[PDB]
Design an enzyme around this catalytic site. Structure first.
Site, PDB file in Angstrom:
ATOM      1  N   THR A  12      16.978 -11.513  -3.886  1.00 13.85           N
ATOM      2  CA  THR A  12      17.770 -10.597  -2.915  1.00 13.85           C
ATOM      3  C   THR A  12      17.110 -10.911  -1.175  1.00 13.85           C
ATOM      4  O   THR A  12      17.465 -11.095  -1.008  1.00 13.85           O
ATOM      5  CB  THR A  12      16.859  -9.688  -2.783  1.00 13.85           C
ATOM      6  OG1 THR A  12      17.704  -8.434  -1.857  1.00 13.85           O
ATOM      7  CG2 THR A  12      15.458  -8.858  -3.131  1.00 13.85           C
ATOM      8  N   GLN A  62       8.230   2.718  -6.886  1.00 11.20           N
ATOM      9  CA  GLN A  62       9.939   3.063  -8.086  1.00 11.20           C
ATOM     10  C   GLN A  62       9.500   2.539  -9.249  1.00 11.20           C
ATOM     11  O   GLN A  62       9.905   3.401 -10.156  1.00 11.20           O
ATOM     12  CB  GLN A  62      11.289   2.144  -7.490  1.00 11.20           C
ATOM     13  CG  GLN A  62      11.948   3.204  -7.634  1.00 11.20           C
ATOM     14  CD  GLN A  62      13.416   2.657  -7.164  1.00 11.20           C
ATOM     15  OE1 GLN A  62      13.439   1.201  -6.392  1.00 11.20           O
ATOM     16  NE2 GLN A  62      14.135   2.623  -7.686  1.00 11.20           N
ATOM     17  N   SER A  89       5.959  -6.674  -7.078  1.00 16.00           N
ATOM     18  CA  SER A  89       6.732  -8.134  -7.014  1.00 16.00           C
ATOM     19  C   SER A  89       6.736  -9.448  -6.374  1.00 16.00           C
ATOM     20  O   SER A  89       5.661  -8.910  -5.450  1.00 16.00           O
ATOM     21  CB  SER A  89       7.996  -7.673  -6.401  1.00 16.00           C
ATOM     22  OG  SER A  89       8.118  -7.451  -4.876  1.00 16.00           O
ATOM     23  N   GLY A 133       5.998  -9.110   0.774  1.00 17.19           N
ATOM     24  CA  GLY A 133       4.605  -9.659   1.022  1.00 17.19           C
ATOM     25  C   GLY A 133       3.600  -8.483   1.278  1.00 17.19           C
ATOM     26  O   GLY A 133       2.409  -9.285   0.521  1.00 17.19           O
ATOM     27  N   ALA A 171       4.292  -5.143   5.936  1.00 19.70           N
ATOM     28  CA  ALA A 171       4.079  -6.574   5.712  1.00 19.70           C
ATOM     29  C   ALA A 171       5.381  -7.502   6.196  1.00 19.70           C
ATOM     30  O   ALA A 171       5.187  -9.015   6.609  1.00 19.70           O
ATOM     31  CB  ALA A 171       3.313  -6.978   4.431  1.00 19.70           C
ATOM     32  N   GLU A 192      -9.146  -6.630 -28.168  1.00 22.73           N
ATOM     33  CA  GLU A 192      -8.124  -7.208 -28.833  1.00 22.73           C
ATOM     34  C   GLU A 192      -6.961  -7.629 -29.059  1.00 22.73           C
ATOM     35  O   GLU A 192      -6.705  -9.363 -29.086  1.00 22.73           O
ATOM     36  CB  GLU A 192      -8.249  -5.932 -30.215  1.00 22.73           C
ATOM     37  CG  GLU A 192      -9.583  -5.925 -30.316  1.00 22.73           C
ATOM     38  CD  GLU A 192      -9.255  -4.656 -31.759  1.00 22.73           C
ATOM     39  OE1 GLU A 192      -7.957  -4.121 -31.684  1.00 22.73           O
ATOM     40  OE2 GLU A 192     -10.785  -4.398 -32.344  1.00 22.73           O
TER      41      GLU A 192
HETATM   42  N1  LIG Z   1      12.833  -4.400 -11.967  1.00 26.65           N
HETATM   43  C1  LIG Z   1      12.635  -3.962 -10.486  1.00 26.65           C
HETATM   44  N2  LIG Z   1      12.386  -4.611  -9.662  1.00 26.65           N
HETATM   45  C2  LIG Z   1      12.223  -4.171  -7.707  1.00 26.65           C
HETATM   46  C3  LIG Z   1      12.960  -2.947  -7.434  1.00 26.65           C
HETATM   47  N3  LIG Z   1      12.238  -3.027  -6.317  1.00 26.65           N
HETATM   48  C4  LIG Z   1      11.988  -4.301  -5.544  1.00 26.65           C
HETATM   49  N4  LIG Z   1      12.033  -4.910  -7.025  1.00 26.65           N
HETATM   50  C5  LIG Z   1      12.424  -6.239  -6.225  1.00 26.65           C
HETATM   51  O1  LIG Z   1      11.148  -6.351  -5.049  1.00 26.65           O
HETATM   52  C6  LIG Z   1      11.788  -7.716  -4.137  1.00 26.65           C
HETATM   53  C7  LIG Z   1      11.123  -7.171  -2.567  1.00 26.65           C
HETATM   54  O2  LIG Z   1      10.254  -6.671  -1.996  1.00 26.65           O
HETATM   55  P1  LIG Z   1       9.203  -5.765  -2.181  1.00 26.65           P
HETATM   56  O3  LIG Z   1       8.359  -4.896  -2.489  1.00 26.65           O
HETATM   57  O4  LIG Z   1      10.337  -4.275  -1.447  1.00 26.65           O
HETATM   58  O5  LIG Z   1       8.053  -6.187  -0.627  1.00 26.65           O
HETATM   59  P2  LIG Z   1       6.991  -4.908  -0.476  1.00 26.65           P
HETATM   60  O6  LIG Z   1       6.215  -5.285  -1.584  1.00 26.65           O
HETATM   61  O7  LIG Z   1       7.241  -3.529  -0.175  1.00 26.65           O
HETATM   62  O8  LIG Z   1       6.174  -5.953   0.953  1.00 26.65           O
HETATM   63  P3  LIG Z   1       6.919  -6.161   2.631  1.00 26.65           P
HETATM   64  O9  LIG Z   1       8.432  -5.176   2.315  1.00 26.65           O
HETATM   65  O10 LIG Z   1       6.926  -6.384   3.400  1.00 26.65           O
HETATM   66  O11 LIG Z   1       7.209  -4.356   3.129  1.00 26.65           O
HETATM   67  C8  LIG Z   1      12.664  -7.777  -4.918  1.00 26.65           C
HETATM   68  O12 LIG Z   1      12.673  -8.856  -5.478  1.00 26.65           O
HETATM   69  C9  LIG Z   1      13.504  -6.859  -5.466  1.00 26.65           C
HETATM   70  O13 LIG Z   1      14.358  -6.830  -6.134  1.00 26.65           O
HETATM   71  C10 LIG Z   1      12.643  -1.868  -8.812  1.00 26.65           C
HETATM   72  O14 LIG Z   1      12.840  -0.625  -8.727  1.00 26.65           O
HETATM   73  N5  LIG Z   1      12.969  -2.416 -10.377  1.00 26.65           N
END
Ligand SMILES: Nc1nc2c(ncn2[C@@H]2O[C@H](COP(=O)(O)OP(=O)(O)OP(=O)(O)O)[C@@H](O)[C@H]2O)c(=O)[nH]1
Ligand SMILES: Nc1nc2c(ncn2[C@@H]2O[C@H](COP(=O)(O)CP(=O)(O)OP(=O)(O)O)[C@@H](O)[C@H]2O)c(=O)[nH]1
Ligand SMILES: [Mg+2]
Ligand SMILES: [Mg+2]
Lengths: 426, 310, 428
Positions: C170, C15, C131, C135, C90, C245
Site C-alpha cells: 500500500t 484494528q 506493521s 512509521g 509518525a 515450552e
Molecule cells: N492484516 C491487516 N493489515 C493492516 C490492517 N491495517 C493496516 N494494515 C497494514 O498496516 C500497513 C501501514 O501501517 P499503519 O499501521 O497504517 O501506519 P502506523 O503504524 O499507524 O504509523 P503512521 O502511518 O505514521 O501513523 C499497511 O501495510 C496496512 O496494510 C488490518 O487491520 N489488518
C-alpha cells in the site's frame, strides 16, 4: 488536533476557497449561519481541524482572506456562505496589483502583509497543535502570486517545521487571459520551489476540457471549475476529518510522494466524473474509478502523462470499499503500464481510504500524480518567458517598482534546473 | 576530480588508563578495516604521520591550481575529540606540526612575495556560517539571515557578505579568530565556510583571474536517538544531518559522472555550485579517533567518506 | 496466576486489537460493557464486582483510530487511560515514531505498563502487534522493545507483526522502515510471527469464497490465530503448551525465531457440510503451500521445527496417525539434525464463531507454526526493493531530517544480510 488554517489570496483563490468552504460545510452540515444541522456525529468528531467553536455552538472557519481590491471581499460577503467567515480575517487593500508581481511583493504586499501575519499568528495560537497550512492562489497575476509568495516566505521563516500546501492554478498557454503570465509565474515558482513542501499544479485548460468532454456540459462557468478544484481539495484531507481503514494525512502523502525536496509539483485529478445522461450507464465500482482517474483525459493539469513517467501516485479513495480490490486494481494498473510507472521505485502507488464519501455519491476517489510530464509546463512557460525577456518586453513596470533583471535571470535558471531534475528521472 | 583522504589521530593519555584498544586496522596504504569490514579510500594517513605530509598530499595541488585562476575546495569533518582542531589549525605559530589552514595562508602570502611587481594580488576573505538553514555572518551581528544570489556567469555567492581585505597572515588569523568568537558552539553545531578570493591582475596582458578557495569546517552528524537531546539542539541536529546528506548526495552525483548534479537542495551545496563541478579540484579531509570507545560514531564518519567515491 | 499483557501499536495493531478483544469477550461470554452474566485471568482483570477490564494497552499517534474505539461499542470495556493517543502521527516515518514524536508519549505507556504488570503475579509474556510498513508500528515499537528489554528483559516478548507484501503493498516507503526495525525485531523480541496480507487475500478468495474481502476478515483470522496460541493458557487441555515450552520446542538457536504461521480449517458455512473436516484433512491442508500466512513456497525450504496446537474434539491416536502420514510424505521434507520437529498440542475448547463473521462453526481446528528457511525469500525480494530505493536515495532526506543517518541504513542492511546468511547456513 492537526488543525489547518486556510490562507486564501487573489480573486481566483478567493473563489476557489469559497467553493471549498461550501463543499466542506455541506459535508459537515454547517448552515449559512455557521450553525450545525447535520445528522452523523462523525461530522462533528473532527470539526476543529478547519473550523473553530464560538458562542452559541456557531462554527466559524480558520480561513484568512487576502486581496488588494475590496470587490472580491464584497463578492465573498454577498455570495452564499459569506456570513460563515469571520469579518476580522478580511484583510484587503485598495491599490490592486494589476498583474504586477513587484507591486504585490515589494510595495503594496510588504505594507499589507503585517495585518495578515498578525492574523495568522492569532489563528495559529488559538488552536492546540496544527499540522500544516493551505495557500490557494494563482501564478498569473500579481496579487495572488506575489502576496502569497511573500506571505509563505514569512511563514516558512516563522514556522519551518510544518508541512505546507499550495493549490496553484498555473496559466496554460492556450487559455491566454493576461499578457505577463510567464513573468509572474516564473517569479513565483522561484520561491515556491524552495519554500513550499508540496504543490498541486492545477491548470485552467485542463478543467475546461474536462467540463467540455468528460461531463459534456455546454457552458462551463467558473463555478463548475471551482467545484472540481473543491472536490479535489476536500478529497485530500478527508483522512483527517473522518476515520477510515487506512488513513493518510498531509505529511504521509508528502513523505510518500516527495522523494527529493524539489520534486514536489503534483498534477491532481478527481473521479468519478459523469455527465447527466451517462450517470445511469455507469456502475460505480473500484475498477471503474481506477481506470477513470488514470485516464489522461481526466487530469486537472494540461500535461499528457503518456509523454512522461510516473514517480509517485497517491490514490485517496473515499467509501466502504474492499482493500483487496483496491490494491489488486492499482497493482494491475502498475503492471499494464509498466513503461510509464518508473522502475527504480517499486510500489509507485500510495493508497488511502476512508468510510464517509461526499454528500451525493456512493463512492469517490482522488488522484495526486507526481509525473515527469510537469517539465513540459515549465518548458512552455519558459519559452514564453524568453520570448518576452529577450527583447525586455513589459519590463519597466517591474523595474520601476523595485526589481532587477538579475532576479528574472535567477528565476529562469532555477526553473531550468527544475526541468533538468524532472528530465533525468525519465 | 574528488579525492577523500582520511586521517586517524594518535591516542591521548586520557583514555590510555581507560583501557581502550586500537581497533583501526590497515591494508596497503589506502584502505582501512573496521569491525572486520573494509572501507576503501584514496589515502589513509596514520597517527604517526605529521601535518607536513598530509598537507603536501591534500592541499598543495588545490592551492597550485587556484593560483592559476581555477577554483578549489576543502571539506573538514569529524566528531568531537576526533582531531579537527589539531588537523585544521593545531599549533598557531609553530612551523613544525601546525594545521592546514595556516599553511595554506602562509603559502599564499609566500607565493605572492615571489612574483613580478606588475601583479596586484588582491586577497579578499569571507567567513560565514550556516545555522538552522540560515546563513548567518560571523563578521556582523546584524546580518543574520543572509541569502544567496547568482551573477551573469552562473556563479552563486552570498549577497551581503561582510568581505574584508587582508595583506598578511596575521590579519587572516585575527579575522578567523574574530569570526570563531561568535561561532555557535556548545562542540561545533554549525557549518562554517571560509572563502579565500585571490584576484591576480596582469597589467601587460590586461587579463584578470579570480581564484576562489573554500575551507568548509562541517559539523557533526549526530544520531539524536542516542544522545537524548530535546529543544533547539534537536532542530540543529535535524538541519545538520539534512545538510550533510545533501552534500553526500551531491558528491556522489559528481563522482558517479552523472549528467546532472542537484546543487540546489541545500544552501551549502548552492553556494558551492561552481567550485566542485568541472575544472575544480577538491579534497575531503576526515579526522577520526581510532579508539574503540568512539568506534560507533567513527563508522558514520567513515561512511561519510564512502559517499564520495562509490 | 498466569497473565499476558497485550500492546497494540499503529492502526494495524489497533484494528487487530478490536477484532481480537471481540473474540476474547465472546469466548469467555463477557458482554461489551464488561459485565459477565478461573480462565479469564490470562487476559482480563476484575474491577471488583461485575466488571472485567482487559490486560491491554492500545497505543497510537493517529487520534482517529483510538477515538473510533472511545466512541465504538467497546467504549465501556476499556477506560481512557489504556487508550493512549498522540497528537501528530509518525506519517509512515520510522524516525518520527522512534524519537521525535515517540518521546512525548512513551513515558506514559511505560508508566501504565508498570501499573499493569504490578497488578498481576504470573506474567507469561507480552504481545506487540504492529506493521513493518507504518512509521509508528516500526519506530515506536523499536523504542518500546528497547525500553522493556532494559526494564524486564527476561519476559517472553512476542509480536504478531504484519509484513508488507512484494506486489500487494500500500505504501511507497515500506522497505525502509521494515529493514530499520528488523534490528529490534531480532535483538529484543523472542519469537515473532510474520504475517502477510496477500496470503490472507488468497485464502479468503479460495476457501471462504469472498470476492471483496476488507481488513476486518484479515483481523478476524489473525484473532483466531492468537486464540489458538493462547487457548493453552486460557482453558485447560489434555496436553498444555505454555509460551516458554512453546518457545523452547520451536526456537532452536537464539537468532532463528521467526516461524511463519498457518491456521485451518478456514471454510465458509456452505462448504462446511460437504467437507468432513477430520483431523487428517485439516492437518494435511496446513502443509500445503497455498494455505500459509506468508508468500513463500515451503517446498524450496526445510522445516526445522513446528508446533501443532490442535483444539476441540481431538484424540491423540488420529493425530499420531496423521503425523505418520506427514513424516512419510517426501515433499514435506525436514532438516536432518532435528529428527522430531513436532510439538503436538491438544485442547478441549473448540474455536468460537463471531456473529457476522465469515468463518463457519467447526469442531476441530489447527494452528501450525512452521519454522522454515523459505520465509527468507521474502526478505530477499524485500532487500531487492530496498536496494532499488537505496542506490538512488529516494525519500532519504525525510528520515534524515528527523535524526536518522545513512549509517543506520547500512547497518540494518548488513544485519538482514547476516540473518539471511544464518538461515541459509542452518538449512544444510
Ligand atoms: N492484516 C491487516 N493489515 C493492516 C490492517 N491495517 C493496516 N494494515 C497494514 O498496516 C500497513 C501501514 O501501517 P499503519 O499501521 O497504517 O501506519 P502506523 O503504524 O499507524 O504509523 P503512521 O502511518 O505514521 O501513523 C499497511 O501495510 C496496512 O496494510 C488490518 O487491520 N489488518
Ligand atoms: N480556475 C479558475 N480560474 C479563475 C477563476 N476566476 C478567475 N480565474 C483565472 O485566474 C487568472 C487570474 O487570477 P486573478 O483573477 O485572481 C487576478 P490576481 O488576483 O492574481 O491579481 P490582479 O491581476 O491584480 O487582480 C486568470 O487566468 C483567471 O481566468 C476561477 O474561478 N477559477
Ligand atoms: Mg488581483
Ligand atoms: Mg498510522
Amino acid at each position: 488536533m492537526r488543525e489547518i488554517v486556510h490562507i486564501q489570496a487573489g480573486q481566483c483563490g478567493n473563489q476557489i476557497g469559497a467553493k471549498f468552504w461550501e463543499v466542506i460545510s455541506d459535508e459537515h452540515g454547517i448552515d449559512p449561519t455557521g450553525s450545525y444541522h447535520g445528522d452523523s456525529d462523525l461530522q462533528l468528531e473532527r470539526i476543529n481541524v478547519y473550523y473553530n467553536e464560538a458562542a452559541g455552538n456557531k462554527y466559524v472557519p480558520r480561513a484568512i482572506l487576502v486581496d488588494l481590491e475590496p470587490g472580491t471581499m464584497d463578492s465573498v460577503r454577498s455570495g452564499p456562505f459569506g456570513q460563515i467567515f469571520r469579518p476580522d480575517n478580511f484583510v484587503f487593500g485598495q491599490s490592486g496589483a494589476g498583474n504586477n508581481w513587484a507591486k504585490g511583493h515589494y510595495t503594496e504586499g510588504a505594507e499589507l502583509v503585517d495585518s495578515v501575519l498578525d492574523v495568522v499568528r492569532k489563528e495559529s495560537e488559538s488552536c492546540d497543535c496544527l499540522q500544516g497550512f493551505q495557500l490557494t492562489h494563482s501564478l498569473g497575476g500579481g496579487t495572488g502570486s506575489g502576496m502569497g509568495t511573500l506571505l509563505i516566505s514569512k511563514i516558512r521563516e516563522e514556522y519551518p517545521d510544518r508541512i505546507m500546501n499550495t493549490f496553484s492554478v498555473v496559466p496554460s498557454p492556450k487559455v491566454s487571459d493576461t499578457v505577463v503570465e510567464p513573468y509572474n509565474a516564473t517569479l513565483s515558482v522561484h520561491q515556491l520551489v524552495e519554500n513550499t513542501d508540496e504543490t498541486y499544479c492545477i491548470d485552467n485548460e485542463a478543467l475546461y476540457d474536462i467540463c467540455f468532454r468528460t461531463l459534456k456540459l455546454t457552458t462551463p462557468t467558473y463555478g463548475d471549475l471551482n467545484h472540481l478544484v473543491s472536490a479535489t481539495m476536500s478529497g485530500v484531507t478527508t483522512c483527517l476529518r473522518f476515520p477510515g481503514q487506512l488513513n493518510a494525512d498531509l505529511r504521509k502523502l508528502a513523505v510518500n510522494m516527495v522523494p527529493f525536496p524539489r520534486l514536489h509539483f503534483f498534477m491532481p485529478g478527481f473521479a468519478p466524473l459523469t455527465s447527466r445522461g451517462s450517470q445511469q450507464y455507469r456502475a460505480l465500482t473500484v475498477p471503474e474509478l481506477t481506470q477513470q482517474m488514470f485516464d489522461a483525459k481526466n487530469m486537472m493539469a494540461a500535461c499528457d502523462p503518456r509523454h512522461g513517467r510516473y514517480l509517485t501516485v497517491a490514490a485517496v479513495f473515499r467509501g466502504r470499499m474492499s482493500m483487496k480490490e483496491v490494491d489488486e486494481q492499482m497493482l494491475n494498473v502498475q503492471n499494464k503500464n509498466s513503461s510509464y510507472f518508473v522502475e527504480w521505485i517499486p510500489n509507485n502507488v500510495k493508497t488511502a481510504v476512508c468510510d464517509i464519501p461526499p454528500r451525493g455519491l456512493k463512492m469517490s476517489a482522488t488522484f495526486i500524480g507526481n509525473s515527469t510530464a510537469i517539465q513540459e509546463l515549465f518548458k512552455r512557460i519558459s519559452e514564453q518567458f524568453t520570448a518576452m525577456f529577450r527583447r525586455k518586453a513589459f519590463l519597466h513596470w517591474y523595474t520601476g517598482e523595485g526589481m532587477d533583471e538579475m532576479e528574472f535571470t535567477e528565476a529562469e535558471s532555477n526553473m531550468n534546473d527544475l526541468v533538468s531534475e524532472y528530465q533525468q528521472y525519465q | 576530480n574528488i579525492k577523500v583522504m582520511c586521517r586517524f589521530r594518535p591516542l591521548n593519555e586520557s583514555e590510555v588508563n581507560r583501557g581502550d584498544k586500537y581497533i583501526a586496522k590497515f591494508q596497503g596504504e589506502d584502505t582501512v578495516v573496521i569491525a572486520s569490514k573494509p572501507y576503501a579510500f584514496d589515502r589513509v594517513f596514520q597517527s604517526s604521520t605529521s601535518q607536513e605530509q598530509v598537507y603536501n598530499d591534500a592541499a598543495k595541488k588545490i592551492v597550485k591550481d587556484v593560483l592559476e585562476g581555477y577554483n578549489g575546495t576543502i571539506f573538514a569533518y569529524g566528531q568531537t575529540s576526533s582531531g579537527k582542531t589539531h588537523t585544521m589549525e593545531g599549533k598557531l605559530h609553530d612551523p613544525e606540526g601546525m594545521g592546514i589552514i595556516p599553511r595554506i595562508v602562509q603559502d599564499i602570502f609566500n607565493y605572492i612575495y615571489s612574483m613580478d611587481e606588475n601583479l596586484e594580488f588582491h586577497i579578499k576573505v569571507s567567513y560565514f556560517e550556516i545555522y538552522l538553514d540560515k546563513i548567518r555572518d560571523l563578521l556582523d551581528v546584524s546580518k543574520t539571515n543572509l541569502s544567496v544570489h547568482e551573477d551573469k556567469n552562473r556563479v552563486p555567492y552570498v549577497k551581503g557578505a561582510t568581505e574584508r581585505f587582508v595583506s598578511s597572515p596575521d590579519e587572516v588569523m585575527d579575522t578567523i579568530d574574530e569570526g570563531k568568537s561568535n561561532r555557535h558552539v556548545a562542540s561545533s553545531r554549525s557549518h562554517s565556510i571560509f572563502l579565500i578570493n585571490v584576484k591576480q591582475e596582469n597589467t601587460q596582458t590586461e587579463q584578470k583571474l579570480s581564484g576562489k578557495l573554500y575551507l568548509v569546517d562541517l559539523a557533526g552528524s549526530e544520531k539524536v536517538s542516542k544522545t537524548g537531546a530535546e529543544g533547539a539542539v534537536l532542530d540543529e541536529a535535524k538541519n545538520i544531518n539534512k545538510s550533510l546528506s545533501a552534500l553526500g548526495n551531491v558528491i556522489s552525483a559528481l563522482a558517479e559522472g552523472s549528467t546532472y548534479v542537484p546543487y540546489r537542495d541545500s544552501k551549502m551545496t548552492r553556494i558551492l555550485q561552481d567550485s566542485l563541478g568541472g575544472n575544480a579540484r577538491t579534497t575531503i579531509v576526515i579526522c577520526c579517533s581510532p579508539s574503540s570507545y568512539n568506534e560507533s560514531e567513527t563508522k558514520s564518519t567513515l561512511l561519510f567518506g564512502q559517499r564520495a567515491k562509490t | 496466576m498466569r497473565e499476558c499483557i497485550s500492546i497494540h501499536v499503529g492502526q494495524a495493531g489497533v484494528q487487530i486489537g478490536n477484532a481480537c478483544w471481540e473474540l476474547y469477550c465472546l469466548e469467555h461470554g463477557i458482554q461489551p460493557d464488561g459485565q459477565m452474566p478461573d480462565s479469564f485471568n490470562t487476559f482480563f482483570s476484575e474491577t471488583g464486582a461485575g466488571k472485567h477490564v482487559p490486560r491491554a494497552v492500545f497505543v497510537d499517534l493517529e487520534p482517529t483510530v483510538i477515538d473510533e474505539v472511545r466512541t465504538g461499542t467497546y467504549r465501556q470495556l476499556f477506560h481512557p487511560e489504556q487508550l493512549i493517543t498522540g497528537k501528530e502521527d509518525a506519517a509512515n516515518n520510522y524516525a518520527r515514531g522512534h524519537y521525535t514524536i515517540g518521546k512525548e508519549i512513551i513515558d506514559l505507556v511505560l508508566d501504565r505498563i508498570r501499573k499493569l504488570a504490578d497488578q498481576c503475579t504470573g506474567l507469561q509474556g507480552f504481545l506487540v502487534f504492529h506493521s513493518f510498513g507504518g512509521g509508528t508500528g516500526s519506530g515506536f515499537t523499536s523504542l518500546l522493545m528497547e525500553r522493556l528489554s532494559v526494564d524486564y528483559g527476561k519476559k517472553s516478548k512476542l509480536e504478531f507483526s504484519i509484513y508488507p507484501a512484494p506486489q500487494v503493498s500500500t505504501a511507497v516507503v515500506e522497505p525502509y522502515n521494515s529493514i530499520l526495525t528488523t534490528h529490534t525485531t531480532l535483538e529484543h523480541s523472542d519469537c515473532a510471527f510474520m504475517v502477510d496480507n496477500e496470503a490472507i487475500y488468497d485464502i479468503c478468495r479460495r476457501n471462504l469464497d469472498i470476492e471483496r474481502p476488507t481488513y476486518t476478515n484479515l483481523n478476524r483470522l489473525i484473532s483466531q490465530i492468537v486464540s489458538s496460541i493462547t487457548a493453552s493458557l486460557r482453558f485447560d487441555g489434555a496436553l498444555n503448551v505454555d509460551l516458554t515450552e512453546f518457545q523452547t520446542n520451536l526456537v532452536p538457536y537464539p537468532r532463528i525465531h521467526f516461524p511463519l504461521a498457518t491456521y485451518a480449517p478456514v471454510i465458509s458455512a456452505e462448504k462446511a457440510y460437504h467437507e468432513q473436516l477430520s483431523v487428517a484433512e485439516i492437518t494435511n491442508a496446513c502443509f500445503e503451500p497455498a494455505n500459509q500466512m506468508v508468500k513463500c513456497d515451503p517446498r524450496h525450504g526445510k522445516y526445522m521445527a513446528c508446533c501443532l496446537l490442535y483444539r476441540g474434539d481431538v484424540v491423540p491416536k488420529d493425530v499420531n496417525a496423521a503425523i505418520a502420514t506427514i513424516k512419510t510424505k517426501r515433499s514435506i521434507q525436514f532438516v536432518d539434525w532435528c529428527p522430531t520437529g513436532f510439538k503436538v498440542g491438544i485442547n478441549y475448547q473448540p474455536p468460537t464463531v463471531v456473529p457476522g463473521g465469515d468463518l463457519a462453526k467447526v469442531q476441530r481446528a489447527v494452528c501450525m507454526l512452521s519454522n522454515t528457511t523459505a520465509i527468507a525469500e521474502a526478505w530477499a525480494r524485500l532487500d531487492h526493493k530496498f536496494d532499488l530505493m537505496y542506490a538512488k536515495r529516494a525519500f532519504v532526506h525525510w528520515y534524515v531530517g528527523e535524526g536518522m543517518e545513512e549509517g543506520e541504513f547500512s547497518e540494518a542492511r548488513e544485519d538482514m544480510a547476516a540473518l539471511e546468511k544464518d538461515y541459509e547456513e542452518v538449512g544444510v
